[PDB]
Amino acid sequence: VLAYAAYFDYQRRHNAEFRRQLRRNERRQARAEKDLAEASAKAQRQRIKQAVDEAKEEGFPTSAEDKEAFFLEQVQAGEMMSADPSKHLEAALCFYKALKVYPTPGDLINIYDKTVSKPILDILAEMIAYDSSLR
Amino acid sequence: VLAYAAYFDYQRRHNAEFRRQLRRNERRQARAEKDLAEASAKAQRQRIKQAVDEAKEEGFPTSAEDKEAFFLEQVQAGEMMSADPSKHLEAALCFYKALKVYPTPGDLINIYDKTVSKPILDILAEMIAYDSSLR
Amino acid sequence: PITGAYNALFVSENASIVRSVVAFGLAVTFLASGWAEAILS
Amino acid sequence: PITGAYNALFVSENASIVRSVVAFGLAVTFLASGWAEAILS
Amino acid sequence: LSDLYDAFQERRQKLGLSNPGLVENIAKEVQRDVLTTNLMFSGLRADLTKAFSLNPLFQVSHQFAMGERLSPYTFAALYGTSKMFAQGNIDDQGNLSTTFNYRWTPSFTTKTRFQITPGATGQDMAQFEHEYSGADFTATIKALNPSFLEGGLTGIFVGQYLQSITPKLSLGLEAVWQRAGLTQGPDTAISYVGRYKTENWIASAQLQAQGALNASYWQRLGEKVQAGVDMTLSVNTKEGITTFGAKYDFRMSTFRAQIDTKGKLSCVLEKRVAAPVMMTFAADVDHFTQQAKVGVGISIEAGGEELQDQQPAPNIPF
Amino acid sequence: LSDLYDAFQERRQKLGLSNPGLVENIAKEVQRDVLTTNLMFSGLRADLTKAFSLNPLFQVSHQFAMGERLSPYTFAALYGTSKMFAQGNIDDQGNLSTTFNYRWTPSFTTKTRFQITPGATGQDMAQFEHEYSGADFTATIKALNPSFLEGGLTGIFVGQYLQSITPKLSLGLEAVWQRAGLTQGPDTAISYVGRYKTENWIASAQLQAQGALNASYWQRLGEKVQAGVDMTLSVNTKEGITTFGAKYDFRMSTFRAQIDTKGKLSCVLEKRVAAPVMMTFAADVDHFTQQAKVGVGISIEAGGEELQDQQPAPNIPF
Amino acid sequence: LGADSKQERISKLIEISRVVIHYGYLPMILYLGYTRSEPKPSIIRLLSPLS
Amino acid sequence: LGADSKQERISKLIEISRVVIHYGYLPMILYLGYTRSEPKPSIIRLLSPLS
Amino acid sequence: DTDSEISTESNFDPSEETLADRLHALRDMVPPAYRGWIYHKYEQTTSAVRKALSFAGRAAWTVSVTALLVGVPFSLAYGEDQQYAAMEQEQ
Amino acid sequence: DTDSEISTESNFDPSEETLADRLHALRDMVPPAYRGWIYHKYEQTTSAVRKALSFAGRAAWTVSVTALLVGVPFSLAYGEDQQYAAMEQEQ
Amino acid sequence: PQPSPEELRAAEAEAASTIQRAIATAAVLYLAPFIVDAVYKMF
Amino acid sequence: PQPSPEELRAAEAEAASTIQRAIATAAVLYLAPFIVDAVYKMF
Ligand SMILES: C[C@@H]1CC[C@@]2(OC1)O[C@H]1C[C@H]3[C@@H]4CC=C5C[C@@H](OCCC(CO)CO)CC[C@]5(C)[C@H]4CC[C@]3(C)[C@H]1[C@@H]2C
Ligand SMILES: C[C@@H]1CC[C@@]2(OC1)O[C@H]1C[C@H]3[C@@H]4CC=C5C[C@@H](OCCC(CO)CO)CC[C@]5(C)[C@H]4CC[C@]3(C)[C@H]1[C@@H]2C
Ligand SMILES: C[C@@H]1CC[C@@]2(OC1)O[C@H]1C[C@H]3[C@@H]4CC=C5C[C@@H](OCCC(CO)CO)CC[C@]5(C)[C@H]4CC[C@]3(C)[C@H]1[C@@H]2C
Ligand SMILES: C[C@@H]1CC[C@@]2(OC1)O[C@H]1C[C@H]3[C@@H]4CC=C5C[C@@H](OCCC(CO)CO)CC[C@]5(C)[C@H]4CC[C@]3(C)[C@H]1[C@@H]2C
Ligand SMILES: C[C@@H]1CC[C@@]2(OC1)O[C@H]1C[C@H]3[C@@H]4CC=C5C[C@@H](OCCC(CO)CO)CC[C@]5(C)[C@H]4CC[C@]3(C)[C@H]1[C@@H]2C
């Protein structure tokens, strides 16, 4: 191994073509890894977009008593899911649904921004930006 | 006793002057009892007015961190006192002080109106009406 | 085999019903077969 | 008399200090006087 | 006519049937004699019982407790006779629970219960119960908060029937009728029950019309050991739990232990630490959360030992 | 010069003084031998201890627990010798607490402690302790989290001194120096202590420079009974609590009970239910809230009974 | 069906009966025992916990 | 006072020492006992709770 | 308080009074000031009695639980100790 | 990925490399795709091992506590029962 | 929501029919042992 | 709030003086038994 390692190091140091072959392979891989990240981010972005779209189909309660009850249930559902790191998307959706039902979203955002963990807030923040209808 | 009661009843029924003497005494007492209630209400009103005046002298925090900390302390103090029916005036004062520090008093009023007991709310409601500076 | 059994035993809408029914079947057999009397007594 | 003692024993800023100090004085006397040995032993 | 009634009654008596007992007892051997469910508690408890007589029965009891949903103090008194039994117990908060059972006939019994709470108006309640015990069957009708003040029958009514089909098999029925408010329609539910009983083992089932099923099996494992298994299914979501447990009858102590499919483990040890004193230790362990509830209690019966000359009154309608 | 040193040392030895022991032990007879404070617990607990040797000492222990702030499992191992003692115990969450004591000289001891928690960076800590035990005094210096990485001394440092003034009276001193961050000034606190010790009774006091005072008295009430009272005063608001308790040493059990001016009552009963098994029952009752905490536990030491041929190693630096 | 005045009177009977049972039921049981027990206990012992 | 590069290296030693003590301290104690105990226990019995 | 206002009740009759009114007249005999002042003292006195009983009950509970929690384990431990002393003494 | 871009690293030298750089070159020998894919499997495999140990540890705790909570009271009760049987048999 | 008056009458009839079906079963059970006796005597 | 640099130097001196006063007491205690001996011998 040492003889090969010495030859490999010697070739890399003194042979420019050997570096060029390796550098080309590394640069090619660097492109794939960045492209893979962007694909993963878009898929995550799609999930966030999908979650906001799903909330529109179920609809929201209209009466004050149902809105408060639904809000509490959504807050309770979001909080219950917030403890599980695998439900951050679902927890944010409950917080998003509740935020859309709460009469003063801006105040509730300040509560979530301080009481909800940042990983969930990051998804919820994009949900607010994606749902341009949120006041 | 029965002979006196029969005579008393007979006199009240057949002697108009006997009724007039008794009626005059009852009417005179009725005035005193109503006047006493008004005096008690004014004294209670004075205590409410005094409580709002006292809050102005202590002043309120200006920084956001102190306002939130003070608000939580006032809410905690008000809630701790709210469990004791003898501290309803002091509890309302803490809720009043907190309400004056909270950025959106109208939303907090809806919370107090539903979470705080009516006897405390009645004092707090008059405090809001007395403190014309409350937004 | 296992795929058709594990799913119906721990990750199905009736998983809790199946576990309770199976456990009862075992417990009764353990008692009625006389093994319990030979072990617990 | 009682007015000057009850106030300083249960409704004063140091009421908790006085109660702890008095209780200690009694407990030590109860032990040191030999009554505790005659009752608890 | 008596001609058929006498012939029918005679043919009935020659069948060798026996009274199966109350419907609520078809699972007693498991749910009460083996499982710990009815004995489990937490915190500290102390019962000081004084017996003043055995015929008529009369005893007064002071209970001190400090634990989950246990009232700090409870005073209870009871009086019993071969024809009647009256009991009342009151908490430190004034909640009074009472019982008054009277035998109008050896085969007919009236049971009255009250629960008066000063703090809550909803809590106050009254339950009237009537029982008949034939040679081979039992019938029962209950009326909980029965009222006609609104111009219509309201409250909760329950009817129970259990019939011995053969010397070992018993089949029964239960029916409920409810009307919480005259403005809403009455609700009715029916439950079917049955039991097969033998010296060594007993099998029972309780099927609700709602779909829930409760089944149990009890078997004796010798003179000092007996065990049973109880299963509950609900279809309100689908949920079910099965409990297996055993009971040991030693000379000075009784040990009960059980475990169920939800991962809970519990045990109860009652030990006669003295002639009038009995200790109880209860522990319930939830293996999914690793939390345990510990219960320690004591029972003292000073009166009974000093009055052996009169024996307990018979057939007190407890 | 040795001329004065020898004459001084000789005059010192002829005074009949004795080593008073660690400052932290001036109230041991009350706060640990009589009061229940160090034994109280809640929930269920089980310690399974296996002794593998007595010289050198080596034993391994598994603790299972289910209660308030009790870790579900704790594995502990220790090794001891007349010159050293090493112990480590780890929770199910990986929190590792360790001890390593070594005798560089029979009168000088180094004690090292660590507390490594994976979950919290704040929790991790290290405590170095040095003790000297003269013929009539003890001196100690501690360094908790000592660091100079910021270019200045930081952490917590404690110095303790206790001197026997006469065969019965002991007087002492304690000093603390702290600097949590180089950006802020150092904080120092001093505490004065003293004790008067006799065969029948012991009196001790601990005065903080902050104004708090802790005083205690211990007295023996015969060969099987001893009792003590402990008082604590704080002037941070003014608050004070006084605890009175007694301990009974029966053949197969030890019973401790105490009550204090805040209305709390607690008792601990340790009973040798078997030769290797010891039970513990603890109950703490708060009379102002009527709530009780019940604790039941057990200790098992299988190894010790089967190896009597080697006796415990002397002066293990526990 | 039922007269409104009758419902008020009938409800009043329940209210009175509730209070009587709340206060009178336990002393009644103690009275039955004390007079019918064999033997008859002392008034002090009648509610002594263990003496 | 102290060089910034030195503080990084010194801090690294604490980080490594912390991990070693976390993993190595208990096995070390078990090793000392197992080799120096009188008598020497079995590897299986060395951590058996009561057998 | 005017003679003309009180004069409006010029005529009254015993038969015109209803059973409820005749029963109410019995309460009218007592001066309202005294009955109002007596009722006030009654509330204060009744409250004090309830406070005393609550305190007396709460104290008895404390002594009962204290004696039990301490007396029960001790009595068992002390009793068992005496048995060992008896068995050892019989040797 | 252009021949002119890669050609910028025309010259290199063994001595110019720093000790950290020479050590980093050792890691460069392994293909990044394989090492990245091996690291991924390592995380998944290490997580599974930790899950297995947590489950195995949690199961052993359950059996240990179950046997103790049931075996301890029973062993004491059963043992005491045998003593009464022995003392009664000695009569 | 609150029920309509005709729906209440439908519920009242339904409830009565259920309890009537129960009492019909109780009568069958009371007669059941004689039926079970015949089966053992049929063979 | 954060302290000023001159206040820190004041605290550092104060802290040092306190510990120096403690060590002065420890020296007194170490010498205290000989002092107590003299008192018993003065009479
Ligand atoms: C409907 C659900 C499905 C599971 C289940 O019900 C619920 O189905 C039941 C079938 C039962 C078994 C039937 C027969 C026998 C044979 C007998 O052996 C002595 C026979 C003797 C003849 O002479 C000597 O051979 C011992 C008992 C045993 C094993 C039963 C055990 C309990 C079982 C398994 C029941 C179990 C709980
Ligand atoms: C309302 C529901 C109806 C079912 C049920 O209630 C609910 O009612 C009981 C009917 C019982 C069975 C009836 C008869 C026998 C034959 C017997 O044979 C032993 C030998 C013997 C006769 O040959 C001679 O010794 C073995 C047991 C078995 C199968 C019963 C099992 C339990 C059952 C299923 C009970 C169950 C709980
Ligand atoms: C730092 C603080 C200084 C005080 C203190 O620490 C704190 O230090 C101890 C000094 C003690 C006293 C010293 C001497 C005696 C004389 C003795 O006389 C018995 C007879 C005997 C001699 O004549 C012959 O038998 C009775 C007791 C008494 C008063 C001590 C009481 C407890 C005291 C106050 C202790 C207290 C805790
Ligand atoms: C005032 C309040 C109510 C009553 C009460 O205080 C509070 O009064 C205390 C007196 C205590 C008893 C004294 C002595 C014994 C004997 C002992 O030894 C049995 C040995 C065995 C040998 O075979 C049989 O002799 C068993 C326990 C017992 C009965 C005590 C129990 C607890 C009692 C009842 C306490 C109880 C709580
Ligand atoms: C595997 C896990 C660890 C180990 C463990 O399971 C779980 O294994 C169980 C075996 C049990 C013991 C069996 C028998 C007895 C004898 C009994 O009788 C004494 C009478 C007295 C007369 O003088 C002396 O002989 C006392 C109790 C004791 C030691 C049991 C204690 C609990 C033990 C240790 C259990 C323990 C928790």
Numbering used by the authors:
A (entry chain L), B (entry chain K): 22 to 156
C (entry chain H), D (entry chain G): 16 to 56
E (entry chain B), F (entry chain A): 21 to 256, 265, 267 to 347
G (entry chain J), H (entry chain I): 21 to 71
I (entry chain C), J (entry chain D): 28 to 118
K (entry chain F), L (entry chain E): 8 to 50
Task: Tell me what the authors wrote about this structure, in their words.
The translocase of the outer mitochondrial membrane (TOM) is the entry gate for the majority of proteins imported into mitochondria as precursor proteins, or preproteins. In humans and fungi, the TOM core complex is a membrane-embedded dimer of twofold symmetry, consisting of two copies each of the β-barrel Tom40 pore, the α-helical Tom22 receptor, and the small α-helical structural subunits Tom5, Tom6, and Tom7 (3). Two other preprotein receptors, Tom20 and Tom70, are loosely bound to the TOM core, forming the TOM holo complex. We determined TOM core and holo structures with and without the bound MTS of rat aldehyde dehydrogenase (pALDH), revealing numerous interaction sites with the Tom20 receptor and the Tom40 translocation pore.
Applying 3D variability analysis to the same set of particles resulted in two unique classes of the TOM holo complex that exhibited a major connecting density above the cytoplasmic face of the Tom40 twin pores. Joint refinement of these two classes resulted in a C2-symmetrical map of the TOM holo complex at 3.2 Å resolution. Likewise, in our 3.2 Å resolution structure of the symmetric TOM holo complex, two copies of the Tom20 receptor interact with each other at their receptor domains and are stabilized by the cytoplasmic domain of Tom22, consistent with our previous N. crassa model. The symmetric Tom20 receptors extend along the membrane plane and rest above the twin Tom40 pores. On closer inspection, we found that the hydrophobic binding grooves of the Tom20 receptors are oriented toward each other. We refer to this as the “handshake” conformation, in which both Tom20s rest at the center of the complex. In the difference map, three elongated densities occupy the space inside one of the Tom40 translocation pores, suggesting multiple preprotein binding sites. The longest preprotein density interacts with the loop between Tom40 strands β2-β3 on the cytoplasmic side of the pore, suggesting a possible entrance contact site, in accordance with previously published cross-linking studies. On the cytoplasmic side, the preprotein appears in two positions as it interacts with each Tom20 receptor domain, between helices α4- α5 in one case, and α3 in the other.
